[PDB]
């Protein structure tokens, strides 16, 4: 059973993950496979004499972005560092360790460079960051009537200077502003 | 100067107990000796975010450079972003990106090709095997170039005004005359030797690129930070291959070979060893983060002083009477051009 | 205080089966069951517990009456309806204050609702209850605590659950508890004013991770997500190397006991199915291993001593025995780690 | 936390077990508790070092923005720095930076120098600014136009190297008197 | 003895401290009690 | 203002197991725990 997470007990070695075809150049005497850091990577099939790699299961980390509970109860889920078509089929086949199942309406899918956001939708506008998601994406609570949106950073208001050969802007007035440093 | 490092967000539960219910139960006796580690690592990640934001997000409005580039003979195409490059990056930043090779980029979603690695799985897949993951940075390495471009545009078309109040335009010749005036030389010298000084600036900007190209490692500080993080991570992963004084090094082997109440001693030994290794790694990460935060504060002060104005303090903005500086983005760092 | 505890609870917004009454199916018991019942005065007396509900395994009966209770862990035969017919292997009769408390404000509108929870971890039957004339439509929505009433060490096996009725001349709210981590909000007077599950909602996971009822705007890293393995493969080398067991049990001239032929079995895989299919055994007693546990243990060397002998001599052949065979023909050491096979 | 022993409370374990078997469990308790204390003290040391760095920065900010005026940009508040008043805070300090920020600005014109009679004139302080018809001098962060006299400018040059030089007349109060 | 540091052995639970009247609300099924961070704090008198 | 501290070059085997082969062997079972210490001490000397 290849290309599927499965517990394997190859000739006494036990582990978890996904195995598939490989293009090693295994020497005939070789039986195991490893890497620089001494982790079992490739296993030769004892009953087929083919080469299969061993993969992690689904590694990532779930992060929840939420507004203040006194404001709203809607929440959105972040699946860090995973192509979330993988979790989409994982949610469908219901082999995910997380038991809380947040809705998937098709519009709440987000292939972020930093993982996948679920429970939020794109807004191609640009607003100042409220909650940092990562990979230049920020979520915030906004009125449509209220939901959780995800959008790219706006580094600031777009401004263009008027540099010229003989142009000077000289302030005719001034202001006094009192800020605070803590 | 480095500004930040990669953000690691290890999970003790699995890093110490690979998908073992009995091992997780045994670890549950050690109290809140995990929530502390996770809180420390997330604090380090947030600290890195604030360091990069403090270093680069110094100006609110993102200025753009005028379409025509003739700043009195000063040639700025080597530091100005190149529209031909799809990443909108300057040629100098191109070399800075090319000369640094990251072992772990983080923004890879590498799951799906560890099975397809064909060859021996690399450091990243190996880390993904034993409870190690890297959180990609908030500020994408592209928008950092945009902030750098905005800062560069502010300091060559508006002088040092945009860091104080509204950005007021000023041509580069009299901006040059003023930076001269702040040192002790009257503007007549610049207005008499403008062609000579422009040729000097062009020659220097030509030579700096070749100096960065031909050197074996002049970016040795950023390379050093990356190598330190990678080496610490690799040692931390390798530590799971030590028996720590028990029968074997594999939890699923000990559990499946020995009975619960006798394998309890060995699994306790493994817990005490692996968790101590994780603690040492977290402490070293804390020290490195403190040093990097100090360097980032120094870099922020350097930016706001040298780039955003003329610094009277000697040797701070390069050796000699300082005139200006241009910022340039780098992987996990910044490069200044005094 | 906002203490967090992990113990077998009923999940929040879980699914509860609601029954009527006008025949009393035997609902399975596993990891406890939450019970609730609303009534005008009374239509329910008690419950019975255990497995197979007959006079073969110990059972339970907790019927109440007007003034006391009738808790007993006995081996009742059957009722099919004077609620038991056997008290032979029966002990531990428990009597205390009646569970059912009924109060009315001079009207039947104050229909009392009663929530009962039972569990059997390491024995020690625990009964939790709280009686109050709630709004009376059905299971309420406002939070209510449960105060344990009795905690008694039954120490028996329970699999099936059943409820008893009354006589006369809208209840049965049944839910199954699950092992979950919970956090409970304690009043300054000590009562539980609120509780949140930690396996239901992402917001619940966040509130649980920080053990607080107010989460400020922001991101919170709560746990790790895993694709659990769907199937489990076991694969071992193609080696078969069947042992000469075939030639030791297909022989035609099994030597006598006085000269017992001893065969050294080495360099083979000891599969015991070829042993099981070859002889309709009559004495397959083992001493150091289990007849069932033989294919999962690995040994250094195996000796197969074969000899045909009489019937009673089969029972004679055993460690620490005596007789004309056990003394002069073949003596089994008291510390023998193996098996004998007689057919 | 039990730390892998019988119980997490010493005053119970000492009376529940005799010494020659209880010393092992109490040693487990000692090692767990002291490892936790080592973690706590290391974290406290790191926090104290960070607080010391912040305190040194705050002390420099005090002695610079309060006991004098800072020419450093973006150190004593955003914009040009004028003054600063300190305020005590719980386990910290709070500043009130008073900063000079310019205001409404207008394009006028500029020229690097003025050539009156074969000689290039440069402003002693400020730039040469033009309404559009009459050239003027002014300060840098405030528009205060002034008549171009011999006092505002110093003359040095030959009117043939300054690119963008602009023709106008300068004045002096000595020819008049 | 109240208001006096004393070695107590209440119901086999050993310790040292000062006993005094408290205004807590122990349930009849409550026996030991505790405080926020897991230390035996208010033990009701088994007799009185 | 201090500028540097005394440079230290502590050694794993010589400090922990003075010339004991069995002790060194059982230290090897602890993995590369202490190579980190040697590298860190080299680092502190370098920064001094
Ligand atoms: C410079 O800017 C000041 C405010 O930023 C101006 O002061 C204002 O004056 C108006 C009336 O002229 C008031 O109504 C207002 O409350 C404020 O005090 C000031 O006039 C301005 N100066 C110039 C020369 O434009
Ligand atoms: C500013 O400096 C640039 C250096 O990157 C000049 O680009 C050059 O273009 C020539 C071809 O015209 C190339 O052969 C050379 O390698 C370099 O890329 C650019 O012309 C120059 N511009 C001005 C106005 O001085
Ligand atoms: C805890 O229990 C106390 C004892 O009854 C309560 O105090 C009482 O409060 C009532 C009003 O509710 C007063 O009338 C009475 O005199 C006494 O002070 C207290 O309220 C209660 N706290 C809770 C339930 O949160
Ligand atoms: C050039 O600068 C002059 C300042 O001296 C402005 O001239 C003013 O014009 C009024 C009448 O038009 C005079 O009464 C006044 O004394 C002053 O000289 C002039 O507006 C300005 N030109 C432009 C185009 O801004
Ligand atoms: C400023 O005024 C000068 C005369 O006072 C001008 O010099 C003239 O230059 C022309 C050639 O451009 C000669 O033919 C003439 O003899 C005289 O030298 C000068 O050009 C002028 N400059 C500007 C910018 O107006
Ligand atoms: C394994 O054994 C079976 C049984 O005869 C045989 O059909 C198969 O070809 C063998 N495969 C290998 C790789 O030895
Ligand atoms: C991850 O991204 C998409 C979505 O799954 C798909 O192309 C593939 O699974 C992965 N691609 C790469 C380049 O890793
Ligand atoms: C609007 O958003 C969509 C994605 O939902 C994007 O493809 C499109 O380019 C956006 N339009 C603009 C003008 O940004
Ligand atoms: C400035 O002058 C140069 C030549 O003198 C010309 O090429 C350029 O276009 C001018 N730019 C502006 C903004 O006037
Ligand atoms: C309870 O049962 C109904 C009908 O069988 C079902 O639709 C519902 O999902 C169940 N409740 C839960 C929480 O699954
Ligand atoms: C109720 O049950 C108790 C249990 O001991 C019993 O003594 C009593 O006779 C029963 N009947 C009444 C009316 O109390
Ligand atoms: C008591 O239990 C034994 C063992 O199960 C059983 O054989 C016997 O019949 C029981 N006594 C009865 C039912 O009276
Ligand atoms: C001997 O082997 C044959 C061939 O498999 C089998 O049919 C027969 O039952 C065996 N007899 C004994 C006594 O093992
Ligand atoms: C200067 O002129 C340019 C030309 O368009 C204009 O955009 C800019 O706003 C002007 N600056 C001012 C009025 O301060
Ligand atoms: C003895 O214990 C019983 C139990 O309730 C009770 O009478 C009382 O607590 C004690 N009697 C005394 C102290 O005289």
Author numbering:
A (entry chain B): 534 to 677, 689 to 726
B (entry chain A): 727 to 1064
C (entry chain B): 47 to 68, 80 to 138, 158 to 210, 212 to 246, 263 to 436
D (entry chain B): 968 to 1144
E (entry chain C): 534 to 581
F (entry chain C): 727 to 774
Text of the article:
The dense glycan shield consisting of 22–23 N-glycosylation sequons per protomer is an essential feature of SARS-CoV-2 S architecture. The glycans have been shown to play intrinsic and extrinsic roles in protein folding, modulating conformational activation and immune evasion. The transition to the ‘up’ state exposures of RBD for the binding to hACE2 is also a prerequisite for S-mediated viral fusion, directly correlating with infectivity. Here, we dissected the role of N354-linked glycosylation, acquired by BA.2.86 sub-lineages, as a RBD conformational control element in attenuating viral infectivity.
